[PDB]
Amino acid sequence: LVQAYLILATTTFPYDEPLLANSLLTQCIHTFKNFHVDDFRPLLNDDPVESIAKVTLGRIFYRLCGCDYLQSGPRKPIALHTEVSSLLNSTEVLYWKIISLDRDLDQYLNKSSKPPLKTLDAIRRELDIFQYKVDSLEEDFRSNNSRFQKFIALFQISTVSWKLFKMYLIYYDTADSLLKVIHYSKVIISLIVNNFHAKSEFFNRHPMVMQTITRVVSFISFYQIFVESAAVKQLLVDLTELTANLPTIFGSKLDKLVYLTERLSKLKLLWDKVQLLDSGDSFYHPVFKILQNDIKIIELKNDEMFSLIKGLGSLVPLNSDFRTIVEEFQSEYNISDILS
Amino acid sequence: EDRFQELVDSLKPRTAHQYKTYYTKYIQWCQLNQIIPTPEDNSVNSVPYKDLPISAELIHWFLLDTLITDDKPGEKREETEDLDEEEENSFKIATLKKIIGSLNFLSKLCKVHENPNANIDTKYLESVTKLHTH
Amino acid sequence: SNVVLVSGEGERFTVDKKIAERSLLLKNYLNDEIVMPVPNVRSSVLQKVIEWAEHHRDSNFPDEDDDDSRKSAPVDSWDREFLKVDQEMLYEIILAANYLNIKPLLDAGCKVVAEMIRGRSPEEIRRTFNIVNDFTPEEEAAIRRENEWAE
Amino acid sequence: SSKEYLPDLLLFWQNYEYWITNIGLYKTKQRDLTRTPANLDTDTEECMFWMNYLQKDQSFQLMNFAMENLGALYFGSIGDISELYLRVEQYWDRRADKNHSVDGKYWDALIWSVFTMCIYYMPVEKLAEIFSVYPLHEYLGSNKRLNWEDGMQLVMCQNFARCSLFQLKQCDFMAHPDIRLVQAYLILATTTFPYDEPLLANSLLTQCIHTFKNFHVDDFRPLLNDDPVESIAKVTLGRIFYRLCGCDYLQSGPRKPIALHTEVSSLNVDVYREENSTEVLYWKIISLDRDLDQYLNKSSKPPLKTLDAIRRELDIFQYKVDSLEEDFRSNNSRFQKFIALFQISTVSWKLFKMYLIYYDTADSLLKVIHYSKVIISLIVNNFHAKSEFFNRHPMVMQTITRVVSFISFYQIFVESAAVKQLLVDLTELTANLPTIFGSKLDKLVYLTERLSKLKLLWDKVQLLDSGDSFYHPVFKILQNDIKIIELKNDEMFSLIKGLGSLVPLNSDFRTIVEEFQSEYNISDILS
Amino acid sequence: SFNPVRFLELPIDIRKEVYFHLDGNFCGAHPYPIDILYKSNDVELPGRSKRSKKLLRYMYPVFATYLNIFEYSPQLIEKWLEYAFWLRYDCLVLDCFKVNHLYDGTLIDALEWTYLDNELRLAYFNKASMLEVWYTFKEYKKWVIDSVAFDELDLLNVSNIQFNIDNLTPQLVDKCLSILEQKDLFATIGEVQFGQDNQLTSISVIRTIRSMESMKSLRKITVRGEKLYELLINFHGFRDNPGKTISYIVKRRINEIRLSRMNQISRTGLADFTRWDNLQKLVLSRVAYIDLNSIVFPKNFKSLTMKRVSKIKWWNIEENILKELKVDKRTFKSLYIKEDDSKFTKFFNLRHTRIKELDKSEINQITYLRCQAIVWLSFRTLNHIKLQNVSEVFNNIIVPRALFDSKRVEIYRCEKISQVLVI
Amino acid sequence: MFNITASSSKEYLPDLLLFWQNYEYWITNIGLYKTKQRDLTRTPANLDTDTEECMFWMNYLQKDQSFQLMNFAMENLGALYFGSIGDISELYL
Known part of the structure; x- marks a missing residue:
């Protein structure tokens, strides 16, 4: 069961059926913790069949905490990765270290406490170490498995680098950090576009190039809304051209990403044609209220209280130009068109 | 016995036994000087609280004759070293404040036992404390 | 109505129900003539326990979870004129109150043992020095040598 | 001049109880996978018969029996059943349709779980x-x-339980989590369904924990700024949560790792003493049992302050269960009285058993015998009219297993005269328990018989002293029973048989031990 | 003639309930408690042999620090000094310490570090502040701890010893902490006290605080003065004081804060525990006035016990309830109070207070949950309350149902307290 | 996303990028991928529609096509199945 789900989670199965994949992952955590292995190291005393079995459970546990992280929503409450330590064969543990560093970065999204500078610097030193480790993986060009291996390692370490320098740009605004964000975005583009010129077009179907491109094109659109720059505009044109040329096997999620990029493009026009107000310390603008409500609508949709009220029986739930522009833009480009 | 609950609660047990030691010294001084008469000799004397003569001048004259008229007719001559005498008269001013507080507490104890004598007139003893402090 | 406290020898003591619900164990046992065995208690000790409950039917005891009202409560005049008995039968009354979960009998019947452990003569603390072993004879020699100088 | 082995043998009973009577007897399902069938043509023609066998008026008679005689079981989970008669009506209306919505199939699965509870308690x-x-x-x-x-x-x-599960599996209930799954399992958990399928019940309970924690509700107190529908929704959710912790603790073991119960009733924790004591009284009496049965597998003595605290909360819940309402005109009040009194008798017995084992306090053996007689007096009292089915709740099977196993274990080594009469009384009671427990009752009778034959083996072979520790065949047989069932409750062998082509590879007393293990094997209690 | 072996053969529950009522008074030379020495029309006054001169010359200057307090009636002292040779070696006393440590510090309270006879030995004080038992730490680990800690290592560690400055002089605080520094015994102590009978702390308090980080087993801190409460354990609005304060790493360690004897905790506007973000319990021991609307109550604490107070305001829950169901206070008291006494209200007596309750029939089950949400909004997740000796609560006392059940609130000395309504 | 007349100050940008660190989660992480807005009165589910569907999709894939699929996985997907199933040459059997 655990092996079949870890094969299925290398596709877009955990995004076409997210609640079913979360229940399958809860069953996989239940089936994995059933065996009660607290140490995945080959001990000398045991049977050398049981040592191979514990090596197998180590390399399955790495992929299982990877798929545990990649579904860390509010519709998946039971965690496996809490029983692992943190950083603050020999190539599968590399993906584990990079995904754990990505988790240590992206855990600061939903919480309000901004991370320290020493934490991001320690992540930066470890990032440079694993960048040297990924750049040292030798590969045969005729052996396509090792090429796809190096692509996965290099794309994951570039995604972690981009998220680290995005957190530098956001949480502290360190001098000469926007250049590093643009640099690693161009690295991601130069990785994905390279696969069209080597007849290995299926490399761009792995689900990390949907997640990463979603984060990158949404952040570059959101930054081109407010702070204009010519390099950011050329980067946004490159992101839009790349988003139009991602493979068709993503299907609905690709078209919803194109819709989200188009909506954040129209929001720039709305920011331009409407003048910013103030209140001395507080600032008012329709773009600000629309971006408030885009979070509020989806927090209302991921509120499972209404399904609880429908499940408990006969309980039926009984629930200037500023507001005009906001309601017309929400009627025209609704945020609930990215849902399924 | 209405006020005895907030009278024990005003002090620690340690401070209450220190204060009882100090006014036991005071009542011994009053019996050897016969300010209050002893009931009998070669018996456990049990003087009441109703008729205990307490005033400002009696407390201060006790303080004279015990604490600050340091006669000691065989051991007066141990006041030579300046650091030892500094520690010793720091002990004198500490026991001065403690005996003034203990006899103030004895006055507060005797006023509820129907003794109209124990009025301390505390500015007198505050002037004495400020004098020795100066 | 009435309950029956069967003792450890075999006798039957008919007690009134409101009196015998002083025992927490019997008052919980009644939630099913209602007999109940009390196995480790002789007939005289159970008679003393029932006489205690017969007197203290009407009295009011602390809330079994106190620091002040349970430790610093004095014993009653009847409770001190009631336990002037043999010492072993006093401990058997305490065992009977610890079986039947009668907490105020385990309160007033056991502050007497506290008043007997303290308030005893310091000569027979020196006499009862190693009645239970508790020390090596080398340490006993060292302890008796340390306070040899006084007496 | 006495029996000196006995304290470090009662400390061994604290491990033998967990690895036989808790894990080995009720929560062990030794399944091979090259022999077990798997089909959707066998069950889809069998459950069709078991759903066509019931009729309309028979189902309404089952629901009338639930409304009149089982209110201590469903009312925590599904609320009052007068809202559920409409769901039985809608099930018999929607019987002939060919397009079933999932919101209909969850109510169908819930009322078939209610029908399973009605069949089990009738x-x-x-x-x-x-x-x-x-x-x-x-x-x-x-x-x-x-x-x-x-x-x-x-x-x-x-088979009604299996049809309720088949209607859950038609919901695609992993792809559509909803509170009716949690309600259907909390109805099915009052039967022997958690003991007929001890590996399916753990996975359904893991799905119910995933379904509950999907809602992200931690505080069941209705806030000031809530919808007045949402307030009653969170109150019913709190009742479902404490019923789920009650039916979640009872399946703890090595084959159920993901636990929901995280709080403490004495002395971090998250979610306790915020909720009004209405039917969390069933939880509070089980957390007070969890604080005793967490020292079975653990190898350290419980501190005596903890046992005194547990004794004080026992007395408090005695006076609280005697503070309940005397609704004698509804027959479910006596059954709720029996549940919340049998639980406190069980926790009292376990408390004074741990006093007897770990510390040997004042007359603790007599307290063990007294609360064993209280358990007997609660079960024998139900052999009258109108309340004969009260002895079918699975807590009496658990408790009679623990009590008759401890008394049979203690009759071996201590020649007593009250323990012997008590053991004869529990043997007569175990041969008079309801027959709806099935194979578990026969395995309990077999375990009591095995401990009696082991007593007969104790008197036979003379005890071999060695100065520092003793030696006897009975000791080695009791050592080996735990080792056999720990070998059976280790899923590493099925893992080696599962990863692929991997193959698993690893005097006077020994003859008597192997003859006793060949004649009276411990593997008979698994099946 | 008392028999020790016959006492030590009966089992340990009876021995607990012996040494629970024998409070700490192991001696027959106890001082009279300070309730008869004031309730008297008499003053016990002194008025000396060949042997007693030897004891008062040779034994007494070793113990002249903690026992010069009892110079009134020195028959107490020349009765004491014959206990002082043998009482610490007694089998009853050592059995009391065995069943204390085996029940985790419950029976007799708070062994104390001291420095007498040049050793840095432990000490036990009774409620009358008299030493009775003094053990050096090798002897205490040898013949009481190791007599009950045979083989389980969760009971060898002894971490319940208090420290208790104001017992002893600040030079002796310095010497005691120096000898405690040269050994690895900071994990041995379990709680500290504070004395000192604007920000001008004493020398002993600074010496205690500057080594308080080194404990790593510290809980249960306590102070004893209103002119010292505001200086280290209240927040007071101070946010930057590097020296002389109490070292934020060790604010996380403690479990409770005892407040011994004061007048008011809200001398300023707000008596806030904004820090101490990890304490679970708080005991107000003899504070005269407290205002429950003036404490900030940290993010997860459980018990607020309080005793011997003279005036309580309350959390003024009633003024927020009367906004909800929208009545006047007289109409509320006349109509919406039921005073139910079913069986659990009559379990714990409270024969002086009259326990009241709202209506199940005149409130429609929602605005009933809102009236309960008011109470749980004003408590902010506490459970244990334990009102001992009190007088004259100003507001009416409002306790929720889930907390008034299971005996989690408990009014003990009910004399002037009355009319606790339960919602 | 902020912390009367018009202005040109830039206090909106530092609180606005911190608002991006919430918007990115609730839109591009949770809302776009991990949110499936379901409805249970409208969803059909049984075991008559999908059983013959699975029969058809297993009878569709012939025998020798599966070995070409497995050869493609062995030659061109080595960084995916090795974390889960190890070696796929053991899976030809």
Whole structure:
């Protein structure tokens, strides 16, 4: 069961059926913790069949905490990765270290406490170490498995680098950090576009190039809304051209990403044609209220209280130009068109 | 016995036994000087609280004759070293404040036992404390 | 109505129900003539326990979870004129109150043992020095040598 | 001049109880995978018969029996059943349709779980007036004269449970989590469904924990700024949560790692003493049991301050269960009284058992015998009319297992005169328990018989002293029973048989030990 | 003639309930408690042999620090000094310490570090502040701890010893902490006290605080003065004081804060525990006035016990309830109070207070949950309350149902307290 | 996303990028991928529609096509199945 789900989670199965994949992952955590292995190291005393079995459970546990992280929503409450330590064969543990560093970065999204500078610097030193480790993986060009291996390692370490320098740009605004964000975005583009010129077009179907491109094109659109720059505009044109040329096997999620990029493009026009107000310390603008409500609508949709009220029986739930522009833009480009 | 609950609660047990030691010294001084008469000799004397003569001048004259008229007719001559005498008269001013507080507490104890004598007139003893402090 | 406290020898003591619900164990046992065995208690000790409950039917005891009202409560005049008995039968009354979960009998019947452990003569603390072993004879020699100088 | 081995043998009982009577007897399902079948043509023609066997008026008689006699079981989970008569009406309306919504199939699964509870808790005299013996035997093809009291009500209970599970599996209930899954499992957990399938119940309980924690509700107190529908929704959710912790603790073991119960009732924690004592009183009496049964597998003594605190909360819940309402005109009040009094008698017995084992306090053996007689007096009292089915709740099977195993273990080594009469009384009681427990009752009788034959082996072989520790065949047999069931509750062997082509590879007393293990094997209690 | 072996053969529950009522008074030379020495029309006054001169010359200057307090009636002292040779070696006393440590510090309270006879030995004080038992730490680990800690290592560690400055002089605080520094015994102590009978702390308090980080087993801190409460354990609005304060790493360690004897905790506007973000319990021991609307109550604490107070305001829950169901206070008291006494209200007596309750029939089950949400909004997740000796609560006392059940609130000395309504 | 007349100050940008660190989660992480807005009165589910569907999709894939699929996985997907199933040459059997 655990092996079949870890094969299925290398596709877009955990995004076409997210609640079913979360229940399958809860069953996989239940089936994995059933065996009660607290140490995945080959001990000398045991049977050398049981040592191979514990090596197998180590390399399955790495992929299982990877798929545990990649579904860390509010519709998946039971965690496996809490029983692992943190950083603050020999190539599968590399993906584990990079995904754990990505988790240590992206855990600061939903919480309000901004991370320290020493934490991001320690992540930066470890990032440079694993960048040297990924750049040292030798590969045969005729052996396509090792090429796809190096692509996965290099794309994951570039995604972690981009998220680290995005957190530098956001949480502290360190001098000469926007250049590093643009640099690693161009690295991601130069990785994905390279696969069209080597007849290995299926490399761009792995689900990390949907997640990463979603984060990158949404952040570059959101930054081109407010702070204009010519390099950011050329980067946004490159992101839009790349988003139009991602493979068709993503299907609905690709078209919803194109819709989200188009909506954040129209929001720039709305920011331009409407003048910013103030209140001395507080600032008012329709773009600000629309971006408030885009979070509020989806927090209302991921509120499972209404399904609880429908499940408990006969309980039926009984629930200037500023507001005009906001309601017309929400009627025209609704945020609930990215849902399924 | 209405006020005895907030009278024990005003002090620690340690401070209450220190204060009882100090006014036991005071009542011994009053019996050897016969300010209050002893009931009998070669018996456990049990003087009441109703008729205990307490005033400002009696407390201060006790303080004279015990604490600050340091006669000691065989051991007066141990006041030579300046650091030892500094520690010793720091002990004198500490026991001065403690005996003034203990006899103030004895006055507060005797006023509820129907003794109209124990009025301390505390500015007198505050002037004495400020004098020795100066 | 009435309950029956069967003792450890075999006798039957008919007690009134409101009196015998002083025992927490019997008052919980009644939630099913209602007999109940009390196995480790002789007939005289159970008679003393029932006489205690017969007197203290009407009295009011602390809330079994106190620091002040349970430790610093004095014993009653009847409770001190009631336990002037043999010492072993006093401990058997305490065992009977610890079986039947009668907490105020385990309160007033056991502050007497506290008043007997303290308030005893310091000569027979020196006499009862190693009645239970508790020390090596080398340490006993060292302890008796340390306070040899006084007496 | 006495028996000196006895303290470090009662400390061994604290491990033998967990690895036999808790894990080995109720929560062990030794399954091979190259022999077990797997099909969707066998069950889809069998559960079709078990759903066509019930009729409309028979189902309403089951629901009337639930409304009149089982209010201490469903009311925590599903609320009052007068809202559920409409769901039975809508199930018999929507019986002939061919497009079923998932919001209909969850209510179908919930009312089939309610029907399973009604079949499991019904007396045979009321069961024979409702159903018919002969179509069931003309279908199943077995011994014809096998009337309901002779071991057939258990079969229909298990098959109604399996039909409720089949209607859950038609919901795609992993892809559509909803609170009716949690309610259906909390109805099914009052039967022997958590012991007929101890690996399916753990996975359904993991799905119920995933379904509950999907809602992200931690504080069940209705806030000031809530919808007045949402307030009653969170109150009912809190009742479901504490019922789920109650039915979640009872399945703890090595085959159930993901636990929901995280709080403490004495002395971090998250979610306790915020909720009004209405039917969390069933939880509070089990957390007070969790604080005793967490020292079975653990190898350290419980501190005596903890045992005194547990004794004080026992007295408090005695006076709280005697503070309940005397609704004698509703028959479910006596059953709720029996549940919340039998639980406190069970926790009292376990408390003074741990006093006897770990510390040997004042008359603790007599307190163990006294609360064993209180358990007997609660079960024998139910052999009257109108309350005969009270001895079918699984807590009496758990408690009688623990008590008769401890008294049979203690009769071996301590020649006592009250323990002997107590053991004769519990043997008479175990041979008079309801037959709807099925194979677990026969395995409990077998375990008591094995401990009695082990007593006969204790008197036979003379005890071999060695100065520092003792030696006896009985000791080695009791050592080996735990080792056999720990070998059976280790899923590493099925893992080696599962990863692929991997193959698993690893005097005077020994003869008597191997003859006793060959004649009276411990593997008979697994099945 | 008392028999020790016959006492030590009966089992340990009875021995607990012996040494629970024998409070700490192991001696027969106890001082009279300070309730008869004031309730008297008499003053016990002194008025000396060949042997007693030897004891008062040779034994007494070793113990002249903690026992010069009892110079009134020195028959107490020349009765004491014959206990002082043998009482610490007694089998009853050592059995009391065995069943204390085996029940985790419950029976007799708070062994104390001291420095007498040049050793840095432990000490036990009774409620009358008299030493009775003094053990050096090798002897205490040898013949009481190791007599009950045979083989389980969760009971060898002894971490319940208090420290208790104001017992002893600040030079002796310095010497005691120096000898405690040269050994690895900071994990041995379990709680500290504070004395000192604007920000001008004493020398002993600074010496205690500057080594308080080194404990790593510290809980249960306590102070004893209103002119010292505001200086280290209240927040007071101070946010930057590097020296002389109490070292934020060790604010996380403690479990409770005891407040011994004061007048008011809200001398300023707000008596806030904004820090101490990890304490679970708080005991107000003899504070005269407290205002429950003036404490900030940290993010997860459980018990607020309080005793011997003179005036309580309350959390003024009633003024927020009367906004909800929208009545006047007289109409509320006349109509919406039921005073139910079913069986659990009559379990714990409270024969002086009259326990009241709202209506199940005149409130429609929602605005009933809102009236309960008011109470749980004003408590902010506490459970244990334990009102001992009190007087004259100003507001009416409002306790929720889930907390008034299971005996989690408990009014003990009910004399002037009355009319606790339960919602 | 902020912390009367018009202005040109830039206090909106530092609180606005911190608002991006919430918007990115609730839109591009949770809302776009991990949110499936379901409805249970409208969803059909049984075991008559999908059983013959699975029969058809297993009878569709012939025998020798599966070995070409497995050869493609062995030659061109080595960084995916090795974390889960190890070696796929053991899976030809």
